[model samples]
Target chain A: GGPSVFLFPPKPKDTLMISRTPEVTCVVVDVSHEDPEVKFNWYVDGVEVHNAKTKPREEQYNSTYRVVSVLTVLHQDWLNGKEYKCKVSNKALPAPIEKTISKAKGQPREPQVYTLPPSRDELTKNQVSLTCLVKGFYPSDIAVEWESNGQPENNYKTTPPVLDSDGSFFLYSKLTVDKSRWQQGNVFSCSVMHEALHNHYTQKSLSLS
Target chain B: GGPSVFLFPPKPKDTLMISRTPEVTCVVVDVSHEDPEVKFNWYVDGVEVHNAKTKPREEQYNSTYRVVSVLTVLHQDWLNGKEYKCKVSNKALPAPIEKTISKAKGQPREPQVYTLPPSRDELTKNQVSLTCLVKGFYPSDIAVEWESNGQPENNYKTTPPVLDSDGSFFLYSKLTVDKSRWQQGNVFSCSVMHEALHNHYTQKSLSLS
Candidate 1:
């Protein structure tokens, strides 16, 4: 409550969250040190990136502030699993604080799948939509499929993948169905295929009573 | 991992989660002592409830065990906003652990409203469905209504209320619309009515691009 003495870890590993700038943009955030002495830097596999931008530290309580930086890189490099780092330094600190985000945390965590039923407005006279939420998985590329009443269904759409805060990817897949089929209590299943799954795929079913 | 030692927090308060039994069911959990010395008791206001059920302790890694108890009461009583409590004790502990749920947290937390678009499958030849999620509101009794093209509409359904982990209630409301009405990009709104709302209600709308 008195003096909020903040300490920066020597080297901290961060799973950077990306923003949709049409290109790959890494967003890094850190607490400011006193005034503008806090320096923000970006790198890829040890090579410095010149086109990085850090906004002025925003004010907070107790005379402290926080800083944010954005690093834009070629889309191809990120697609190729290039390693990236954000390093923060200040004269008030004993060492530079660093966070690396590339494809370094290569380990896979099985995705959690959630199937949500269509609401009334989501229905057209002929079709209904079921939302399949597949998230918290690594190695981004994953397969999402749908099944209706034990038969393969085709009318579906998948949204663009987004980076989760935990260094994983979350995807939303929506399937279109005949509204009557859902109203008639037909079962709709969403199947997710991820490398982390023990059976290679996990599925969930939803139906109305 | 040494000899397991368990201490019961004296008179701990809790917000309860209710299950669907067409009645209000209160769940109480506590750590076990040597054998079944742990006792679970339920009370409404001050008097004791006799029909509460406690299951056998389930074994864990250590010699200590855990227990679960369920208290089912009349829906009318819970609907009337009665206070309920679960008191757990064991011979090894100095005092009994208590959890009170009965609308003690009468304070209101504004509900979060989410509107989900209708999927293609949710489309019927003539109508589609839209879902509205209203959750995290206290006092339990809340209202949900729908509107179409700025006009009041009654073609919808609401799911049974569920107790959120934080003791608030979550309600799912769905609206059915003329398939042609939604395809035309008309706005459908879900209005949630809660006492916590300064404006009397909060609204969220969904439409397709």
Candidate 2:
């Protein structure tokens, strides 16, 4: 006879931990028994986002699974009921076991970096530069985004960085923030997004004093 | 009803690449079937590396399958002779089916990159650097080695790099042979070994002209 077939629909895993300040939010799972032939699939509110693959367990069976999604909690849309799911399955199987998880509504966390000088206190009029750095990502997956006050802005971004010999990675984004516009428009922020292990979106916003 | 169960024998695999000349070698497996609550028995060279429940592939299947002994293949070993198997079964099945693969003779096609100097003369003293760069590897696994006068010696090494943003990786190494050594020592060469890919090694040797 052929090999035995098994399927276990994943349940909604609990929230692993939430940072006190919203630098980066992360979720963890224990999919150690997942089929090696199946692909690690991720979805946000039913929409596919990222698909992680089977990785070797570090300390035998204790492969600590994690998924991170970067989001600016300061944005109202994100807090308004957004669900995320991660599934594992192979081409041989039909439907994947969905492991859905949710987040709590809260204020934005502290910035991972001083993307922009706090308080437009005599900030520049020339092309003002801002930078955001996201760290501690495995397998190299990170995203950086810019926003004016609360709106998403398109600024030039560098590619994801490689792990250095010491195991740390460096990622940066540079953009010209119209300093004058902040004084007239209110707040400006820079955000960084990380997937898989931790989904903490850290952003720095300048509030006019 | 209980989750369905699926069974497959251990699959034999060998890494054609190594970070450095191996002093010892071994392999392992981790299994996860389509359904939950099933067990697997992994075998290496037809011997049990891990018994049932040793590192059971249950809730933790997404990460690990099983472990096996790393194949020992040196220049003197058989050109090709090894088979791997993974067996899976459940309460209802008569026996587990085998998913087997074999080790082949010779590595895949690889190009050699030799680092040359501006010029080399009848040796007062000259410096030469030769590098081996192998591209187009799936799963990014490769290794480079250096030999002195055709004999294996420790000179340079680098593991195959992981895929970059564009989905490609490269493996490289460098060896510096002083003209005095070349003229006095006879000949020197470097080889890149893709251990899993087959007799995957590149060599370049020359005397100080």
Candidate 3:
């Protein structure tokens, strides 16, 4: 036998009015035939919010029902960060059903950086290409730059990035330099600037020892 | 079919060994009769990887058939970046089962950044808190910093970051300062450094006018 009830976590919807406190409504939806008058609970940063704009009402037979709690939040608290959660208890469920929503939701993956020296073809052509591998980064809006001995380099070509099924990316940036200068190489570096980096700069430098 | 066939994509398992050619292995397992062979196909940057090091074989009746293909990669090609895709054709599946592995997976979600002024509690304590919200960013390895009048601030406290069910994160970095200085505020800024940023710096600035 299956449980006779199903519940959805609380969610928020907001509407603003001029010269008045903005109303943010937290809505919880549930379906039940065993309990028709189950109470919905709301909390904002640990403070119990009491006041439902809509009471639970079920259609004929066993149907979905909703109870929405509206809380007036100040502009200041909205500007500052706040947490909102909703809950409902039912006998058909082992635990209470709840949902918490906040400003959080940007999952991140840091890119692994690699800098490789010039290939053999580059040496034959009196040129050197510095290869930078920015591997496994998410959200393609990435900032990549090449630095040569503390100065920015201009002669570079970037390959079309490869996209992974998991939303990660692999991009290659090649900076070209004179093979003659490369023989006495000081350093060619790749700088990957991503929000996922603890430091503002994720750098990899390469040179011939 | 009399004997069902299960095929797998080719893959490499060679960690880097400097000055040595690397070996990549592709694998396929299936069940079959005299057709005891399910050859693995390998492609590197679109060229057939030439010859395979070994062929396919099975011991028992429709138990487990395996074909392992090995390809040694040159240093230049490895340095220059190459696309490697492995696939196999099967009778069980109408089409070939192939896999292109190297980087991307999942969906990318960018965080919304916000900077807020001191809360009422901070003001009551003669202190100011500059709150920076790195909301909705995934993979939580984010860089957040605060600066006052263009100088880096040190008196700061960061809240325990909030992680959402979707793998995104909400981190709050607060810079504490004297309310006296806050009242005479020239500027206080929050900087978010993540890989998903095109500009390398997602910043928010606030001042009391």
Candidate 4:
């Protein structure tokens, strides 16, 4: 175990896999306690994947060295029945060490939504900001938009999507309205599109009081 | 934009995803061309993912700054039907930015096998080395062993399993034997156990000349 490299797979829920069968996806390999010059290579179904545009990263923490490489893979290879592995060659690892991907079973899940009411400060300033949060989904592709009275709304700000440890995602889209216009009988909502809905959209609304 | 962060989804085949349906998987969020000190946070289905043991990474290339964070998620969320996002917050990106995972469909496949003959140099030497190569297999959990005349051969070296772009895996197990034992009548074989051949073993035998 002299300066050997160890690869750990992502958690089951957190493994970023393609929702589409037989398509390509990205996988990251973490190499630890190795030299910065160590070489990393990737293979799929006994064939090598190109690394031309790929970048290898080196990190030093507590006087120790580590490296990470990303490999692109296809979902079809997984479904069509294939194999994958990472090959690392270095002077320290004379015989060369390899790490393979452990396959697991999975399916896509749609996201859930919630809307936060405007705060006192936002309302007192004659401006109101409503936050719509979408969470707990997979495949990483989602569409979030704003609507007022069932029509698309503009002048809204959304925070970048956030990822969770369980592989679900979270994001906040905020719609700002003039205090004078934030009167009762107004409905503002966030419309979302996810795999679960297929061609449909889910919306969460907040009625002004 | 002056300074912004963008996160790209993993390649079509190699996206880091859970093979287990409705389970959590790891999703990576890449932030590039931003300030070094920018802060990043993760959320799930409207809740925040913990950043305690997770250390976000920062790198400098060509005088520009970049960062990356990994999130854990469940495939069930995407399939059970939901929405998610990867969000980033920094002074340079006042409004924050987000990326989402789109859903795709997929399933698992079994593995295939091959055995490489020992080279002339190996046979000529007092010691001989036989190699067994296993390719195009999913679910990294595999059992590979060597046998001499149907008995278990314990003295062997196997490279760790390697992953491929197709999400499959490849590995080689080598067995060393005394040249004197490499007679014409001796038989050595490599045995493999995988999902494709559940409760059964696939063996490839090599006969000495």
Candidate 5:
């Protein structure tokens, strides 16, 4: 038989998520057959990515490729509204296998990337304000999680949901953190739990001075 | 003055530890800090070995260096009674800033690592057996943790603690697992936790073959 590829959750259920700092990105795929040896390939914007084989008899866990799976893609830019696809393929048969496509979803109309906070040298120790904005998708159902260093902190405040003029999902979560901790390798991240997507997306920024 | 580096648990009571294997060998290290940033150098039998820092950080969680902090000098040979030492250095310091030395503690020995469970590889499917032979340890707090894929599994069995010949400690536990749902590319890990070490120590193998 020829190679086959499919995406499990085909709909854009808002599962497409992004972390503030991009610590990890979820790449989900479900292969139909229990092939003795199934190889997976990933693709972004029609680009042929790499794949790793998972054997059911040997590998007890389900097949999943996280951000850490392949090193080359981690630093690559994930543009908003870009169409990404993971096409699994095998050597025995011809053509591509298991094809799943996903989109980079965000609030409506807003820029894709949120500029990171200024380096400690650029900000004053007495006054530290970091504005986190989300756009291009439905923002009302997103729960914004705030943290400092790596742990969740209570010093920050978030903005109320702001509906876009287009009625699409959009919102911004702002956190005002103490500048001292920011200088000490403390990190600030924004995590949102979206009901529509049934997934958690997060973005974190490290103190770079 | 120089680059600042800090240890996760900077004030560790002991830097010496013994590998849990069929032979059970001693791994020692001297950890001291003159500079805030201390870099550790691992040594084996008077020969310089790979330090944990040198190993790719991406593989840390699943690496041998995760526990030892130095790469190279892998198991098997090292567990066969090789003398390993870790030297912590401070770049800011001119020389010999600080150091700490340790070896596996106590008079009696514990269980072997191999008997614990097949690495993640062998446990993919079918019934698997693992036995922990604790020779001498108190309170019988040792436990075995089973994980499927990267996540921990819920249902598992454990044996009660049994005293050894010396009556100092006993065979704390033994376990068996049924991995019928083994999928290709699954990772299985077995971890041991007890009063001997505050946290659990783990070993994992992937089903690559």
Candidate 6:
């Protein structure tokens, strides 16, 4: 069966976050279950908003289910920025679930960077591994680059960022180099680019002793 | 209760678009319906891949439903950027729906700007309205500012960008000022900020009659 999900000002609706005279506000809930009976209730600033429409559908092969409950309000209400919520209850779920619309604008967050060096044994094998971890940033989009001894490195692996529980993102980028090029003092740097820093990048460097 | 929505390397998943040796590949479908019987089929490069799981759900009030089908593949397939497709069918509709995974990366497009001046009658009334429209840009995020007579104007309205069919965005910002302040030869400028242009902005200037 499908997992439960709730979104407010779904997709295009949320785009109004930047406008000064937004006209509509919406809260949506999508619940997936095998049972045919599920209900949705809408609340605006603690008061119930009746007659919200719920769209439902099913798959032909598995007899699976999908339901979307949409609550739309006047632009004035959205301008007021009142709390909007969608309450969903289904037989498949043990209890009712309530999802609130987040009114805060998405702001950029500075990321913390950490660089880890390869183990001594790995270095002894003429191989060096360095991992750069960037944590706790908003707006998932980010760019990471690596440099070895002041020169750009092409052989690197960057993993997709993992979404944190709080809507932030964390990413891992690994760089591997041949020990043959390693000297008594070699440095590897990881540079991160994000809008929060403007044109500046947050960088961390690791050195082999 | 109809066709399924196929989203590959879906939102958040596509965040890995920058990765080199991605370890996971997934294609997901979210279907909305009211029936308890719906099915999903998955194909890779025109070949059926069996044992794929289709998650399903239920509703209590409207008898609605939601289903998700996920196909997991080797990282190698994603690295190779293979074509993956999801086929969905439901009894509610006469025919099945098939959606393909688009592998093309999103790029920024140059924006075109237009400036509109107030009507002649309105100018005689000592009130003026000037609008700047920025069109044909991707990724939606943008910043706009206005200046009158070489000075910044704070009283302006910027509408939420409108999304075009080709994934580009169109935005309009208007500035109204006293006609007396917009003397003949006075200039009004609209400046747009976007990453595609780096540190420079696309600006247009209009002079009063």
lDDT of 3 at A112: 70
lDDT of 1 by residue, B73-110 (tens): 55446544677777766666567666776533466777
Best by lDDT: 1
State the lDDT of candidate 6 residue by residue for A64-165, as single tens digits.
Answer: 556666665554465345777777776766777677773444766777666655533445665555667666676565678898777998766665666654
Regions more than 4 Å wrong, model 1: A1-209, B1-36, B103-209
Badly placed stretches (over 4 Å) of model 4 are A1-38, A45-47, A50-84, A94-105, A114-125, A133-209, B1-209
Write the residue-wise lDDT of candidate 4 on B1-209 in tens digits. Answer: 64454543333222222453232223233344544455556555666667423355545555554455555445445433344456666565558666555343334446555554554434556666566666567656567889988699886665556664456665656666777766655788888865445443588776664
Candidate 1, number of clashes = 40
Summarize candidate 3's per-residue lDDT along A107-207 as a digit string, tens digits. Answer: 65787776655433336765555666665675454667788788998766554445644466656565667887678867888887654565534787878
Per-residue lDDT tens digits of candidate 6, residues B82-176? 67777766666678777767334367676666665554344566556566666667656567889866789986766566665446776656576
Cα displacement (Å) at residue B68, model 6: 32
Question: Positional deviation of B54 in candidate 4, in angstroms?
Answer: 32
Off by over 4 Å in 2: A1-23, A28-209, B1-85, B88-98, B102-109, B116-130, B136-142, B150-155, B161-169, B175-188, B194-200, B206-209
Query: Candidate 6, B38: how far from true, in Å?
Result: 43
Over 4 Å off, model 3? A1-209, B1-105
- CAPRI accuracy category, model 6: incorrect
Select the stronger candidate by DockQ from 2 and 3: 3
Instruction: Tell me each candidate's RMSD, in Å, in order.
Output: 16.0, 19.1, 19.6, 29.3, 24.0, 24.6
Against the correct fold, how does model 4 do in TM-score?
0.29
Work out candidate 4's RMSD over C-alphas: 29.3
Best by TM-score: 1
* lDDT rank order: 1, 6, 3, 4, 2, 5
Each candidate: how many clashes? Answer: 40, 63, 26, 120, 47, 39
C-alpha TM-scores of all predictions: 0.35, 0.30, 0.27, 0.29, 0.23, 0.30
Which 10 consecutive residues of model 2 chain A have the lowest summed lDDT?
A7-16
The C-alpha local distance difference test score for the whole of candidate 4 amounts to 0.56
